[PDB]
Structure formats: C-alpha cells, structure tokens
Amino acid sequence: DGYKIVCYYTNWSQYRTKIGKFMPEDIQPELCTHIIFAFGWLKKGKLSSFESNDETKDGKTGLYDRINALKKANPKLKTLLAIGGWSFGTQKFKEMSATRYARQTFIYSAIPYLRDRNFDGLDIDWEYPKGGDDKKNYVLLLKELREAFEAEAQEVKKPRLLLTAAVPVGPDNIKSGYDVPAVASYLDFINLMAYDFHGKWERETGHNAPLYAPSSDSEWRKQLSVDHAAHLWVKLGAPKEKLIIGMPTYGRTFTLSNPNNFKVNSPASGGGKAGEYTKESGFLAYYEVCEILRNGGAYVWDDEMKVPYAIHGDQWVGFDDEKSIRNKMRWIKDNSFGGAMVWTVDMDDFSGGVCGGNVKYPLIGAMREELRGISRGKDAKDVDWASVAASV
Numbered sequence: 036d037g038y039k040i041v042c043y044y045t046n047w048s049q050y051r052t053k054i055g056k057f058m059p060e061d062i063q064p065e066l067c068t069h070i071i072f073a074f075g076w077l078k079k080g081k082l083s084s085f086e087s088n089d090e091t092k093d094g095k096t097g098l099y100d101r102i103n104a105l106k107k108a109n110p111k112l113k114t115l116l117a118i119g120g121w122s123f124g125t126q127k128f129k130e131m132s133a134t135r136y137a138r139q140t141f142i143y144s145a146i147p148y149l150r151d152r153n154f155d156g157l158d159i160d161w162e163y164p165k166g167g168d169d170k171k172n173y174v175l176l177l178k179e180l181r182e183a184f185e186a187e188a189q190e191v192k193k194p195r196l197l198l199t200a201a202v203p204v205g206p207d208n209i210k211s212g213y214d215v216p217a218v219a220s221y222l223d224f225i226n227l228m229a230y231d232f233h234g235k236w237e238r239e240t241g242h243n244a245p246l247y248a249p250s251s252d253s254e255w256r257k258q259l260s261v262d263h264a265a266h267l268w269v270k271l272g273a274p275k276e277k278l279i280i281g282m283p284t285y286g287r288t289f290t291l292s293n294p295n296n297f298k299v300n301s302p303a304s305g306g307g308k309a310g311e312y313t314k315e316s317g318f319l320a321y322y323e324v325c326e327i328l329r330n331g332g333a334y335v336w337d338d339e340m341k342v343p344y345a346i347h348g349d350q351w352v353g354f355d356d357e358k359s360i361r362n363k364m365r366w367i368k369d370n371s372f373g374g375a376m377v378w379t380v381d382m383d384d385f386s387g388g389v390c391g392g393n394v395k396y397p398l399i400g401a402m403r404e405e406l407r408g409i410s411r412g413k414d415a416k417d418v419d420w421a422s423v424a425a426s427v
C-alpha cells in the first residue's frame with residue numbers, strides 16, 4: 036500500500052545506441068511498485084506480441100521474461116502489459132470494442148496470454164476513444180474485462196489481474212471519449228498522461244508538462260496544465276486515490292524563430308533538432324537534456340509553471356528536473372492523488388553517469404523518495420542546474 040510508483044518500460048528502448056541502450060536488467064527491482072510493459076499488440080482481435088523477441092522461444096529468454104524476472108528480487112513488484120499507444124492507432128480498438136463478440140474474443144484471449152507469461156494485469160492505452168459509439172463501447176470493454184478478471188480470480192484462486200488505463204489530459208479528448216464515472220469504477224487505477232501538453236505541433240514554445248499554466252496563456256490554453264487536468268478528472272468523477280499522475284523523463288523541443296526571444300510562449304519555427312539517442316525532432320530524453328546543460332546550455336526556472344526549460348542557441352527544451360519532479364510529488368501528496376506514473380523508466384539517467392550527480396535514476400529515485408520515503412543513497416544530491424549551467 037501507500038503511494039504508487041508506476042513505471043512504463045518501452046520495448047523499443049532495446050534498440051538505442053551507446054549511453055541510450057537500455058535493457059530490463061537496468062531497472063532496479065525496488066525502484067517502482069508497478070512496471071508496465073509497452074507494448075503488447077492485437078492480432079485477429081486477440082492479445083498478441085509486439086515482436087517475436089518479446090517472447091521466449093528456443094532457449095532464448097525474451098523481454099517479457101526478463102522484465103518479469105525482476106519480481107524474483109522484489110516479490111511485491113507488480114507487472115502489467117499495456118496494449119495500444121500512439122503507433123497502434125484507433126481502428127483496431129474500434130473494431131475490438133464494437134460488439135460483445137469482438138470484446139469477449141479479446142477478453143478470453145487476454146487472460147491466458149497474461150497468465151501464461153506471468154503478468155499481473157492489463158493496461159489499456161487507446162489513444163483515443165472518440166465520439167458517442169467509442170465512449171459507450173470503451174466502458175463496455177472495461178466493464179467486461181473487469182468482470183471476467185473477477186470471475187477468473189475466483190476460479191483459479193490467485194490474486195485478480197489488475198485492469199488499468201492510460202488516459203488523456205486534453206479537455207476535448209476527455210469529453211469526447213470518456214464516461215469518467217464508469218471508466219473510473221471498472222479500473223483499478225488510472226494512469227493520467229500528464230505530459231505532451233505542448234510541443235512542435237504549436238507555433239510558439241510551451242512546456243511539455245507545466246504544473247500550472249503561465250500567465251501569458253489564453254484562458255483556453257490555461258486548461259493545459261498538470262494541475263488543471265488532474266482536477267478535471269476528479270470533477271468528472273474519478274476517485275483521487277485512483278489517479279496516478281504521469282511524470283515525463285523527457286522534454287519537448289522547439290527551434291526559436293529568434294534566439295533572443297526565448298521565454299515560454301515565444302515564436303518557434305518548428306521542433307528542436309533530434310537527439311543522438313532518441314533520434315526524433317521535437318523530443319529529447321532527460322539524459323539528452325543533461326548533456327545540453329553540461330555543454331553550454333542555459334537553464335531557466337519558471338516559477339509560475341514550476342518547471343524548467345533549457346536554451347542553447349535557438350534550441351529550446353521544456354523538461355522536468357529533480358526540482359520540478361520533487362515539487363510535483365509534494366503536489367501529489369497535498370492533493371491526495373494515488374501516486375506517480377513515469378514515462379519512461381528508460382529515459383531517466385538510469386546509468387547514473389550522464390547528468391553529473393552520480394545517482395542512478397535521479398528523477399524516479401526522487402519520486403520514490405518523496406512518496407515512499409526511500410533514500411536514493413548515501414550522498415545522493417540533486418543537480419543544482421542554476422549553478423551548473425549558464426543563465427540568461
């Protein structure tokens with residue numbers, strides 16, 4: 036019991052190079068209370084493997100087993116398999132949820148799939164149900180999943196499979212797709228995706244995950260904050276304790292139209308240049324942001340949003356650091372939410388070698404410290420970026 040620390044592990048992190056290369060054994064068994072494996076997949080309406088190397092076959096241990104092997108060292112650890120995500124899209128969910136036969140086909144495939152692979156539950160990551168049909172059918176899917184999980188638990192006499200979901204922070208997305216009271220009822224807990232609030236799809240800089248909106252925000256734009264989103268879900272009927280608030284170990288990047296105009300809400304010409312390890316314009320891992328800050332980048336703390344951003348030339352990144360993460364943990368406690376969720380475990384400074392404080396998992400370690408009272412170790416000190424990096 037207590038606050039949850041819910042960590043997403045992404046199976047594509049296995050393909051990154053050099054400092055970016057991540058494997059299940061890089062996760063400390065005691066780091067998180069839950070590890071969610073992103074992702075499984077759907078084939079012919081049934082739960083299936085994303086890639087053959089997630090599976091164990093021919094004496095070669097797959098990623099599923101290597102993640103679940105962490106429970107040998109920490110038997111309290113729970114694992115779940117996520118289905119969906121951005122790549123997965125919506126059409127396969129629409130089809131699977133559209134009829135009782137399609138739903139039950141999925142459900143009775145999901146239970147043995149999970150049990151045979153020693154997963155403790157299923158995380159539904161449909162992005163996103165949209166429109167009245169999806170809104171109803173999503174509730175029906177969760178409802179039938181939950182009652183089938185309940186029936187199985189009683190028949191096999193094992194603890195029940197968990198059912199969770201990752202849900203959006205955009206008010207339009209929420210209203211269109213989510214019957215919040217029913218959704219909240221059928222889920223064990225709710226992974227609030229409190230990030231991607233702003234990014235290269237907009238023509239001005241904005242933070243990936245501001246706790247509060249800046250005052251320069253239009254009052255439409257003010258809805259886009261962690262604080263507003265979490266409270267919206269409560270207002271709509273989600274129990275506070277079921278809300279696990281997402282925390283990004285990444286930032287979103289912009290190229291400034293003019294390097295002299297570098298504050299939040301400054302004109303941008305597009306996304307920031309790709310990182311060496313994550314190789315995607317508009318995006319950087321926390322440890323890629325660290326390299327910037329240790330190589331001439333300027334650090335700004337925004338005391339309105341309670342988050343930092345970094346500038347280097349015309350490159351702008353809104354990210355979370357040990358300071359913003361600790362402050363969000365205090366806000367989690369002050370508001371009695373259920374804990375913190377992390378996207379992802381593989382973009383923290385997991386080696387402890389990149390950000391300079393010589394602490395493995397500085398961000399997630401900070402989450403666990405603040406929420407569960409577990410020290411990150413003897414001389415584990417937050418990097419003070421205001422001193423380490425340049426200023427504006």
Ligand SMILES: CC(=O)N[C@@H]1[C@@H](O)[C@H](O[C@@H]2O[C@H](CO)[C@@H](O[C@@H]3O[C@H](CO)[C@@H](O)[C@H](O)[C@H]3NC(C)=O)[C@H](O)[C@H]2NC(C)=O)[C@@H](CO)O[C@H]1O
Nearest residue numbers: 047050117119120121122123160162201228231315318378
């Ligand atoms: C839990 C939740 O709903 N997750 C959201 C994530 O989907 C999202 O991250 C992106 O996820 C997609 C899959 O959903 C990634 O696609 C894969 O990307 C790598 C290369 O980057 C590739 O090697 C994989 O094979 C590929 N798979 C296939 C089969 O498509 C995508 O890269 C992710 N990348 C980024 C930069 O986000 C995150 C981020 O917003 O939000 C989650 O909540």
Ligand SMILES: CC(=O)N[C@@H]1[C@@H](O)[C@H](O[C@@H]2O[C@H](CO)[C@@H](O[C@@H]3O[C@H](CO)[C@@H](O)[C@H](O)[C@H]3NC(C)=O)[C@H](O)[C@H]2NC(C)=O)[C@@H](CO)O[C@H]1O
Nearest residue numbers: 121122162203204205230231232233234235236237259317
């Ligand atoms: C045509 C156009 O660009 N329209 C914009 C809308 O898309 C935008 O909504 C935001 O869309 C972007 C993508 O266009 C979302 O970012 C994506 O987030 C997913 C996970 O949430 C991530 O896996 C993707 O990688 C990422 N895409 C990119 C390109 O980085 C973003 O989450 C949407 N907004 C919110 C609040 O969730 C809105 C913005 O006003 O309208 C147009 O600008």
